[PDB]
Design a protein around this ligand. Sequence first.
Ligand SMILES: CC(C)n1ncc2c(N3CCOCC3)cc(-c3cccc(OC[C@H](O)CN)c3)nc21
Ligand SMILES: CC(C)n1ncc2c(N3CCOCC3)cc(-c3cccc(OC[C@H](O)CN)c3)nc21
Ligand SMILES: Nc1ncnc2c1ncn2[C@@H]1O[C@H](CSCC[C@H](N)C(=O)O)[C@@H](O)[C@H]1O
Ligand SMILES: Nc1ncnc2c1ncn2[C@@H]1O[C@H](CSCC[C@H](N)C(=O)O)[C@@H](O)[C@H]1O
Lengths: 344, 344
Amino acid sequence: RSVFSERTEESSAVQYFQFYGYLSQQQNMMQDYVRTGTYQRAILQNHTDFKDKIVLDVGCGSGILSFFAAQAGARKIYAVEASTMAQHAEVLVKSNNLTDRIVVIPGKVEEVSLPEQVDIIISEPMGYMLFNERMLESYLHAKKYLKPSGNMFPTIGDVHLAPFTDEQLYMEQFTKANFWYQPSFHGVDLSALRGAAVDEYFRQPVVDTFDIRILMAKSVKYTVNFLEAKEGDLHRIEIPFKFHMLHSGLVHGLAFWFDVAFIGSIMTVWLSTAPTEPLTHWYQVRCLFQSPLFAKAGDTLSGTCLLIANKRQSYDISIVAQVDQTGSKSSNLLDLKNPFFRYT
Amino acid sequence: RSVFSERTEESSAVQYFQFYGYLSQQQNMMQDYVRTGTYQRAILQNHTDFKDKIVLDVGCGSGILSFFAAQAGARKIYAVEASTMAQHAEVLVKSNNLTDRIVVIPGKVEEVSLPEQVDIIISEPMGYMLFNERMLESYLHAKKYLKPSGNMFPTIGDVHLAPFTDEQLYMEQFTKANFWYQPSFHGVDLSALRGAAVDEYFRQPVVDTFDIRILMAKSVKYTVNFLEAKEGDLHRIEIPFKFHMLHSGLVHGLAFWFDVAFIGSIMTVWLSTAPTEPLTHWYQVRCLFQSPLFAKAGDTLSGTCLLIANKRQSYDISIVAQVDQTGSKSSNLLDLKNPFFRYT
Ligand SMILES: CC(C)n1ncc2c(N3CCOCC3)cc(-c3cccc(OC[C@H](O)CN)c3)nc21
Ligand SMILES: CC(C)n1ncc2c(N3CCOCC3)cc(-c3cccc(OC[C@H](O)CN)c3)nc21
Ligand SMILES: Nc1ncnc2c1ncn2[C@@H]1O[C@H](CSCC[C@H](N)C(=O)O)[C@@H](O)[C@H]1O
Ligand SMILES: Nc1ncnc2c1ncn2[C@@H]1O[C@H](CSCC[C@H](N)C(=O)O)[C@@H](O)[C@H]1O
């Protein structure tokens, strides 16, 4: 029917809203102090962006960002939420005596009707590696409700990528896969599935944190401007790169992280998930090559990271990389939807 | 329209078969040594139940059990598998040079055709707490292909339950929920949702192992005989109990585990997930009471554990219990499909 259901398979949506419908998941995000404190600070230090203004909160969850908008003096806040968390949010609005200012609207932002246009849209729509969930497209879709010259909080997003070396990680994944190399598992020859097995394990991005000393070159940055982007821009995301290698060694893959900026009238505030910054519930994300690349300090590692949105609220990631000085090439395809959550 | 599609919400089925389509999930079950080792022994040591026989493997996964049937000398094994793991099973049959004896049939056992009737059914259809996944119904459905007087491996399943005391596990729930008991979380009073957070945690069965010293009475068992049972017998499972308390203390809930028996012509072999036995991937399961019950040694703790099948491939669990000598009672509702995997 809607823009949402057209891009989203049934089973994915059901599973996705069940996950966010749990108080325990909302708590996990709320208790990321760097995340929640930075949102509150961006909003309160930019109070003139909220004072007597009309606000839309995309995917309000517990209602937390809407309470921050209210604290900053907003006249009216529409808090849209498609999971069963909406009913919990309406309980909090009543117990906090803000029924006159915060209006919970249950359902998908692609499907509801808002009574008026808004001055500013707030949301926390970043998945791991920024793009997981495809909730950035809901955030962009919501611009149908934004007044001309309205603002977006966050305003921009930067994705960073850098080559890394981590033989321990590589061998950890390699070792699980080589279960399927055994020629006599309880007398059975599994070895014909070894290739399929290496592919499966290496298709999984790795979600955890790491020491910055694994990084082999300065990060390449790709920027999404939320004020200017249309949701269609996010169907196919193409990030070319050329790294000037600062260290010699084996390149085991690319590491990803992201920052968003709240570009307000009074000040710009940054929220970062960089590995040089304090840890957040996003950690960082690594895509391994099953076939690692040898490079020397001063080489250039060049290629393309391509993200193709899929119906399961995620992206098919291809990473083609090469060491220019040798013509050594690595081609990889990752399933962002199904990663190894190594931090657990 | 099949028996399977009628009892199963489409979206639960998609998620279910995706999960089993991964080699790492198959690998997880395979590497449970007690599990895979015991299947192998039970089949090989009952070689006359297999020698020159026709076999059905219900949900073959990688094909592992079917290879054991072949090691035991079966003439023809039909291996049925609904996930994309069926492709991989096919590869292994080829590379193990058994195309003449193992026939992989892709699809649901409720929907495929077998070209002949079989002598024995083999399967591993046991979920956590035995009943999760509702695959025991697929196994029983498969008896439409069994020759009169054919056998089933496993032949019977016993679920055991027993009351437990575990003050620290009980406390953990309030510690977690009390996140919400704050009047000023970044300025927001979260207190109104504390009761809801408590109810959420108590609704999740706890999947983990424990020390046998927590158990307060001898277990009661409930037996399914796979040779005799019909599918409809598993839609509503009523387990009455009268525990004669061996220890005085505070009863915090019921612990569950299960055993299966392979009743062959040569010998009966048992596979136990009891807390007195080495750990398996099934662990054990505990259902908490939000109100604990005081009992002293000698008392009788009586009531009913009722499992009601649902269209998400699992059960709604109702546990009602009382201490006969005092009349104090506790009533609990759990969602077996969404437990707390405490062991992770
Ligand atoms: C499809 C999405 C909803 N999803 N599904 C499962 C899942 C997830 N886990 C964590 C480990 O347990 C299994 C599932 C973590 C995460 C996750 C991990 C790190 C950061 C994160 O950020 C969510 C944003 O705050 C939402 N805007 C989310 N996302 C998960
Ligand atoms: C819908 C069912 C298939 N399902 N879905 C997820 C899931 C699961 N996990 C593992 C923990 O992280 C989340 C998912 C474990 C298990 C699980 C846990 C313990 C034992 C177990 O045994 C499976 C049987 O051996 C299959 N015959 C399976 N089942 C899961
Ligand atoms: N299309 C859509 N319409 C409405 N809500 C959505 C949505 N897509 C995702 N959501 C909701 O958006 C939330 C993102 S998580 C962030 C929750 C909260 N604003 C906070 O910052 O703490 C989830 O609760 C999810 O259910
Ligand atoms: N109704 C059904 N029809 C066919 N296969 C099914 C099924 N329900 C579950 N399965 C398959 O049954 C398997 C259960 S796990 C057991 C796998 C394998 N027999 C082993 O012992 O290692 C999964 O691979 C699952 O996809």
